Structures are given as structure tokens and as C-alpha cells.
Amino acid sequence: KVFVDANRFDIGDLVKASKLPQRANEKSAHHSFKQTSRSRDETCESNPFPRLNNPKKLEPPKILSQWSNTIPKTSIFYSVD
């Protein structure tokens, strides 16, 4: 209802208005991946347990590559894989 950026209330009509309707057939036949358009009607009954449906591990805090040589090379805990 907020983060999908297409079911947004104030600026969702601007997203739904100019689709760039791809009057070229090659622009529609180029991409062959899924759209994954999340509708507004998705409720809490779908995906009840967020850990069984496989999540992603969060990204680490990125550091500057010019100052990457001063990282602590020894970690606190043993991390596997």
C-alpha cells in the first residue's frame, strides 16, 4: 500500500497514467522476465510466517575501498559460510 509505488494514493495515478505504452514490438519482446506486480489486495493471510518463506540476509555496511586496509581482520565470533 505504500512501498509498491503503484498502489500509492497521491502519486499512483501518475504511475498508472504514463506507462510508456511501448508501441514498438521489440520493446515488448525484448524483456522475457516476470513483472512481479504486487497488487493492493494482498493481505496478512498470505505469507503468515516470514522465516519459512526464504528471506534474504541483509547487506553488510559498505566501507570505503581506499580505507579498507584498516578493517579488524579478526572477527569476534566464528561465522560459517
Binding site: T70, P72, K73, T74, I76, F77
Partner: protein
């Protein structure tokens, strides 16, 4: 100790009144027999009432292993920018910047049990 404190919370609430209770409250050790038996359940030692050099700042994120983490002395993370705009902020004072890789472990298991 938990059994004694729970039995005292059972007995004292059924055999005392506010007249005895309000005279027993002292401010030297904040002692209150209704609430003090509840906080003393978890830890056996409990005090009633220089932080960076203690034995709690050093093993905060991980217990057993001690380390002297680097910090900033004149930290401005608590002051709002409405007060920091009044004057220019001084240079950051540094400490413990020579132990960013050095960590020590009080290894008692090898020294007292393996190597006797």
C-alpha cells in the same frame, strides 16, 4: 534465594500494613520490601546505587572476552543541532586507537584445567 524472596512477597503482603511499610523506606539504599524482592530474583549480587574502564563496557557486545573499544571523548551524538549551531565544535578527542586489532582473552580453561 528466589524461594526466600517469593515467600517473603507472599507473607509480607498478607501480614503488614502501610503504617509499618512507610516507616521502613530509607533513601540510603532505596530499600522497599514490595519491589526489591522482585529485582533481586535474577542476579545474586545487587547494588542499590570512569565507565569506560570498568568490567561492563569492555565485555558489552560479547561476554567472556574483554576488549578496549575505541570511542570519542567529546561525543556530540546527544546534543541537538539547534545547540551545536551556536558555536563551532572543537576537534574530536581520540582514545584507544592503538587497540583496533588487539584483543585479549582471560583463558582460564587452558591454564587451570588443561595445563593444570
Amino acid at each position: 534465594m528466589n524461594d526466600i524472596l517469593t515467600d517473603y512477597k507472599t507473607f509480607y503482603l498478607t501480614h503488614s500494613n502501610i503504617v509499618t511499610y512507610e516507616s521502613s523506606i530509607i533513601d540510603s539504599n532505596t530499600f522497599d520490601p514490595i519491589l526489591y524482592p522482585e529485582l533481586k530474583m535474577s542476579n545474586p549480587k545487587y547494588d542499590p546505587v570512569d565507565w569506560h574502564k570498568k568490567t561492563e563496557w569492555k565485555e558489552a557486545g560479547h561476554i567472556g572476552i574483554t576488549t578496549e573499544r575505541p570511542q570519542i571523548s567529546n561525543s556530540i551524538i546527544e546534543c541537538n543541532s539547534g545547540t551545536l549551531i551556536q558555536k563551532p565544535i572543537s576537534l574530536p578527542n581520540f582514545r584507544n586507537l592503538e587497540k583496533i586489532n588487539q584483543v585479549k582473552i582471560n583463558d582460564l580453561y587452558t591454564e587451570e584445567f588443561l595445563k593444570e
